[PDB]
Every structure is written in C-alpha cells, then in structure tokens.
Design an enzyme around this catalytic site. Sequence first.
Site: not given
Length: 1018
Positions: A351, A702, A706
């Site tokens: 990410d 994070d 995700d």
Amino acid sequence: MENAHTKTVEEVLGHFGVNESTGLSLEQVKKLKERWGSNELPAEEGKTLLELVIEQFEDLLVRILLLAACISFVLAWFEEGEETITAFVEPFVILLILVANAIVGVWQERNAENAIEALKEYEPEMGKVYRQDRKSVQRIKAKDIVPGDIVEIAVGDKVPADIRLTSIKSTTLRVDQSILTGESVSVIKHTDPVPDPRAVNQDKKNMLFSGTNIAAGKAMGVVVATGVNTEIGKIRDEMVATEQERTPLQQKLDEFGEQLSKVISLICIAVWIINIGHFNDPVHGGSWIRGAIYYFKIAVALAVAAIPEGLPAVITTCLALGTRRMAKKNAIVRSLPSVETLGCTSVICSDKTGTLTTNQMSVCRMFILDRVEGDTCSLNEFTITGSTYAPIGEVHKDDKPVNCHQYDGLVELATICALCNDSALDYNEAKGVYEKVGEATETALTCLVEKMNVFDTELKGLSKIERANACNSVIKQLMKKEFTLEFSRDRKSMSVYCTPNKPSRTSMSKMFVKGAPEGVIDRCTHIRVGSTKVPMTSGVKQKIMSVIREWGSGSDTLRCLALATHDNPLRREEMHLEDSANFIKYETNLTFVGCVGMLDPPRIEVASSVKLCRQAGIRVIMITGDNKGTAVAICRRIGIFGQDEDVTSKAFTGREFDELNPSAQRDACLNARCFARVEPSHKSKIVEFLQSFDEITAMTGDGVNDAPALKKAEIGIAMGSGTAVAKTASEMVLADDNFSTIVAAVEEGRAIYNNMKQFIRYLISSNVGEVVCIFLTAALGFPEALIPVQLLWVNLVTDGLPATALGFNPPDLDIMNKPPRNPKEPLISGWLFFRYLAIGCYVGAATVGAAAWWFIAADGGPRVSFYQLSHFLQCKEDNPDFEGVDCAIFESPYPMTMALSVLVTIEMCNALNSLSENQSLLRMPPWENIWLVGSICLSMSLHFLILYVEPLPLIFQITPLNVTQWLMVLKISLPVILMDETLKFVARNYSWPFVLLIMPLVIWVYSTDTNFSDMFWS
Ligand code: ALF
Ligand SMILES: [Mg+2]
C-alpha cells in the site's frame, strides 16, 4: 437503490418517496426498517476453545495416535495384577503428549483480537438524523437509520450510512475517506450526478460513505444503503468470507500423514497375516486367548513408531525462536506458522500511503522570482530536505545551504505560508513525534516555514514543545489576521487578510493568496521580484505555467500550490463577507510571490528493500487508492518503475481493470506492477488472481482498505503506526515502521524452512527405523525389543533436543540470492528417500540384532538357543526339553535396554551427520553448531539418568549396563556415520583437527574382537 450516483437527486428522492425536512413518516420508517434491517455490521463470534480443540483433533496423525492410546488402554485392562500401576503409564503418557500438542497448538493459533467487532469503531455512536415530519433535528443513535432517511452531517461527525448528497452548506464539504482510500487528504464533494454505471469510490463525489469523518463543512443528504450494503459492509463481508488456508509446509505434512496412515494400514494387515503363521487356528493352542494381545501390542507399537510425536513440538519451538528473533528486530509476529511462509513469498503487494511513504506531507520544492527577462524570467528554485513533520531541515539551492534572511522573496513567501494556513504543528511529548493538528498541506507549509529561519530566530536551546511553533509565532506577531476567505470550488484558492502590528507601517493592507496554480496565475497581473513589484507579461506566465506542469506531471508529480499577495486590497468595511462569488471578484490583482510543491515522501529504507526483494526473486507490486499519476511517480521514486520506463501496459486503475478482457484480466495481474484508484474489493481481487497462479503473496498495508487484502493473502504485514484494523488483520506487525524488516523476515523464513526440512527428515528417518525394527521383531517372532513407552521417550526428548539443535543451524550463504521455492516442492526426493529408507532399515536391523545378541551370543549373559527358539510364546513348563533355562528370561530388561541404547546412540550419530543435506561430516565439523554437541551430550546425560536414577528404570524396562555391553552398543552404532558419509559421497559424485580427534577412539572401541554364532539362517 442501484447506481444512486448516476441518478439525479430528484430521482433518488422520488424512489424513496422522501422530501427535504419531511423525510419520512412513522410508518414508512418502519417499513424501510423491516425491509432492510439495522445500520449495523454483524460481529464475528469469538472462536470457543472447545471447537478449536475438536478441529485440531481432526488431524489424521493425531487420530491414529489417539486410537493407539485407546487400544493400549484396552490391552492394559486385560493385564494381570502382578504388575503395578506402571502398566497404565503408556496410555497416560500418550494422552499427555496428545493434550500437550493440542494445548501448544491452541497457544500457537490463539489471538484475542477480532477481525470485526473491535475493529469497526469507525461507526458513529450518535448522529443527527431523521428529518421526519415530527420535528427539525433529531440526535438519535445511528443504530437504527433506514435507507430512506435524510441525514445532516457536521464538522467532526462520522457518516452513519451510504448517503447521496443533496445540498451543501458552508460552500465546502471536506470529507476524510482514509478508511476507503488510505489518503487523509480532504475530498471536496458536490451534489451533481456522475453519469457512469461503474465508478470507483473516489470517482463518486456526490456520495458519502460510512465511517468517514468530515474535516470541515456541513451538509444534508439522503441515505442510499445501510448495514451490509455499505462500502464498509463490503469490507466486512470480504473480512468474513476469507478463511486462512494451510501453509504449503502444512499441506506437505498432511500429504505425508495420509501416506503414513495408508502404509500403516498395509503393514498392520501384513503383520496380522504373518501372525497367523506363528499362531494358526489349526494348530492346537490359545490363538484367540493370547495371540490377540501380541498382535495388538504390535499395532500400538507400530502406530507409535510411525508417528513423529516430537515433530509438532520442535516445529513450534523453532517458530517461537524465529518469532523471538523478529521481536528483537522490532517486528512482533502474531502467528508462528506464518514465519516460515515468508521465505516462499512469490509476490509482495504493498500500500502506497503510510507503508511505502511516510504519510506526512512535506514540501520538497519551491521557487521565487529573481530576474525577469524579455518574455522570460529566472526562477530561484529550492529543494527542501525532510520527510517528517519535524522542522529539522534545510533549504538547498543547487545543493548548497542557503540563508533565507538575505532573500526577500523567500521572507515574503514564508510569511504568506505562515499566515495563510489554518493548521499548525504540535509536539507529542509522550510519543516524541510531531503530528499535524489540521490539514496535511497546511501542516507541510508550517513545517517549511519553521525549517528556514527567515527572521534568523535563535533556537540554540529552545524546548521541543516550543520549537514546533516558535518561528510561526514570531511571524504572526508581526502581522495579524483580521479575517480569512474560505476556500471555494469555483476559484479554487484561499485568501487571508492581514494587517501589520507596527503602528507606523506605511503599508497597512495585505491579502495573501494560496491556491491552485491555474486560477491563481490567471488572476495574477503582477510579479513580485525581490522587494520590487513588476508588471506581468505573457512570456513569464507561459514559462511559469510550463514549470508548474513539469513539476506536477513528470518523475515527481508533486501537488502544486501557487502563492500570491494583494498589495492594494479593499478596506475591511467595504467588504461584503457573505458569499463566495464576491471572493473571486475581490481576488483579481494579485502578485505572484512564488510557488511550492509537496508530495508524500517515501521512507529512506524502501528503495533498498525493493531492490533486495528483486534480488531474491520477489516481485513488489504496488496497490493504492491514490491517483495513477502519484502512484507511478512513487513507483519510479522507490525503484519499482524505471525513470524512463514505459508504463502503458504495466500500470492500471480499477476502472480500467474491471472492464478488461478475461484473458487480459489474467494478463494484467501477470505482468502489471502498479494499481491505483482501486477499491478494497479490487485489492482482494488482485490478491486472489495472483494466488490463482499458485503464488504466495505478501500483502503489506496500514489502513482499513488493506484489511480485506491482508486477510485474503497468505501472509499480511501491517505498519506499527497504521490503523488497528490493518494491525489485527495481518499476521505480522512492523513496530519500528522499517521496510527492510520485511526482507530480513524473508531471509529468516528461508533459513527456518531449511532447518525445518533438515530436522523433519531426521525425525522421519528415526521413525521409519523404529517401524522397521518393530516389523522385523513381529515377522521373525523374536521377543519384543522396543516397548512403546521407550519409543515415546526416544521420539520426544532425545530426538527433540537434537531436532532443536538442528533447527539452530547457520543459514546458507546464498540464501537471499536464490529464487523463491516452488510451493509444491516435495519434502523428500527419490535419492534422499532411498538414503533415509536405508538408514531406517539399518536401524531396525541393528536394534533387532542387539536384542538377539543378548539372547544368543551373550558375552557374560544367558545364552539362548538358535532361531528355532526365536518364537517364545510357545515356551511353557514341561516343554519337550527345548533348553534347561528359565522361560521368564525372555522378558528380561537387558535385551530391551540393549535395543534402547542402540537406538539412542544411532539417533545421536544421525543428528551429528544431519547437519548438512549432502556435505560430509568431515568437511564441516559438529563444532560449527555448538548447540548440536550440547544437546547431544545432554541427551546422553538424560539417558544415563533414566538408566541410573532410582525410580526411572522401572517405568522403562531398562537396566544399568556394564562396560562391555556399552562398548558393544557403541560398536553397533558407529557404522551409521560411515554409511551416511558413503551415501553423501555417492550423492555428491552422482576438518583435520576433528578427524584426528576420533582416531584414538575408533581404534579403542574396535580393539576387542567379539564374534557371533547366528549363521544358520543366512
Ligand atoms: F494508503 Al492506501 F491504498 F494508498 F491504503
Ligand atoms: Mg495506507
């Protein structure tokens, strides 16, 4: 309601039968409630310990061991009263090891965190809703909001349900959609419909999504979906529909267990067939009376000998040690079995915001005007060093330190940035990291102002608390903000009116400007060059526009923020501060003081980690909710993409991805390396498509978006500063926010997998040796040599200590330069299978011979007859003079301790030369693993204790051994190392201090020449 964004506000109101301020009636709300339900995400019930235990007992090896324990208990019930409670030690110890395995597995796989209930705290506890006919504003809990309802959302409020915006107050609605996009930037929203049936959440600017807070502004809207039908509902549904699949090592072990069960069945049937020969019904005897206990004693012993009981324990110990090493590297591992699966990672998915980048917006470039040429101008470009909100940084013009006091344009720009910002900077003494109180962009401007001491303020010993805002306070003391002009959609800029504090200042009215380059420059009619105002010209405007475009559309697609100031503003009383339309009219005579450029900067340890991943064969694919341009710029900056690399068929967006052809649908995940503007479902689909190629995928993130991908992937990693949803949906947490810890963990997982293969092969060789021993004893008919409890002790203690020592092996030198292993790799190859089968056959034959050596060729002991009296259950009183010896000598512990000592010493020697797969013991000594020799001497000490302590030789049918029999055991055991070395040499072709150490010992033990007498059957 489907595709509410496409339809106009009138259509979505008419479909629900709803009007503003008269949203619903007391019966329509009830009908909408019963039709849909409640605005709630159903939680995940906690996993009870009983069901976990029952599921963990479903293992086939555990089931066979439990059946063996049960039948052993049945056999022990028939046992006479002559023996003591030691007859029941076997079922008790087997049940004890079974419950120990169950408990250690529960410890391995127990996590208190829940994927939904504790994580979905984004739902507001209370929201002002229900613009029904009763009253105006109702502050009733968000638990019972119906899709037809009208909702008002204010600053700091969290959106209760999927809302299609109808009217906007305050002219701006700044929505933080980090839970769905990962970006903390404020998304300005409107009410106009977007006429596309398929659009990502980012494209939908006329809709509000559940769990997203409002940075600023208030508005009214009509709900569209509630509960499970919301976007966070889709996230939860992805979070619950993904069940973790057994790791490739676990699948290999399950295949091995199935094979072992089938071969156990075949060998047991063969033994029963053979036992008919010794105990035949036509032969007159108690075949059913006493032949049953002998056969079932074989079956229990066979089952115990086959199952590697200590293998789960040693595997758990090795995984725990690796997890402790990770914890010493500031990375806490939540699931032990996922430590080893890191090594076989084919693809790493990541990410962008927060993981690869710092998630702290910082201005990196800025330019001012120094000289203006004919249809041209000279831009004084600067570069800012720093990727953190802390004000520690320096200005760099052509990579040299610059003192900004001398430059006047820099002072004006710093003043404008300080005053034209609403946010600020504060210091958290508890955490030691500066954080943004408000918007990221304004905080970045504040940090830029504080980095350069334009007034040369002294910061020799200022405390960290006051260092955050010292320069900003100094600037604000000079100029005070009478009022501010809020940002507007049409003008796309922000204005602040300021008045000098000095009473005698000649200039008294200044309006500073900060906004998008296009509108601000088009509304700019003059250029500020130093302290001198300069009329604007076409060439300067064109070059400034070109510089802005190259700054915002190239290798580093920075967000561009033009700056300006108004030297002749209208008086405060002359102003009409009601509407935003007058703002653009009052903002028309600006002077372009300068410009700045900012971006989310990647961490200073990501590019090296990416190239190390490429070296080890792991492809790093970036999946982000940000725009494609910023995603590609960050990819190039961290090295995923080349600076000049073409990304036409390698970078995709979610909208591009969905419409793509099924063959190209596969090809995109096959070849593409960057995905931007994707929903969490898109990330899950990426991960699933990658897994469909039989590739282990590592997701790193994070944020909440995700989390579905972190759960779906085999291994998921979460940063130590991200959201708790990512932390608890991932198997690994990087506390120090270091990305190189990922490659370190991959290396440690590869080493752990190698060591696990080594001791798995060692334990399986020991087990097959015991099985061959038991089968030989059963087939020949000789009295038993190894009892099941001795097999338990050998398989658990004296094998787990060497197995742990083998798990302490040093890693390979070329471990990180090799490609990831195929997940379908067989644990045992054909040649290694032959080697370990030969070792097992030799172990069985040696134990059987050592038991028979005491019976037939005893030196200093009772010598029985030849193999004719090998069968012993036919021995009875008044026998036809088979031999003038006691019939009860066949249960003596001396042959049994002979077999036990031979097995233990052979296993110690096998552990010595299991250090390497094919390297001979001569090349690398046992001293290389200092834990190996320590564990082996500890195991020998334990064996000598169980031989010579008072109570222990009763539980195990063993007795202390004299020197001659110990030497006989050593002579039997030693050739196993020579056999292993010979097999290793054959494998290879198809140090000196250690060598000199064993020479005085091998001659001493073999000096005595003792022969045998069993030769007739040969
Ligand atoms: F921070 Al992201 F997709 F860029 F979750
Ligand atoms: Mg993120």
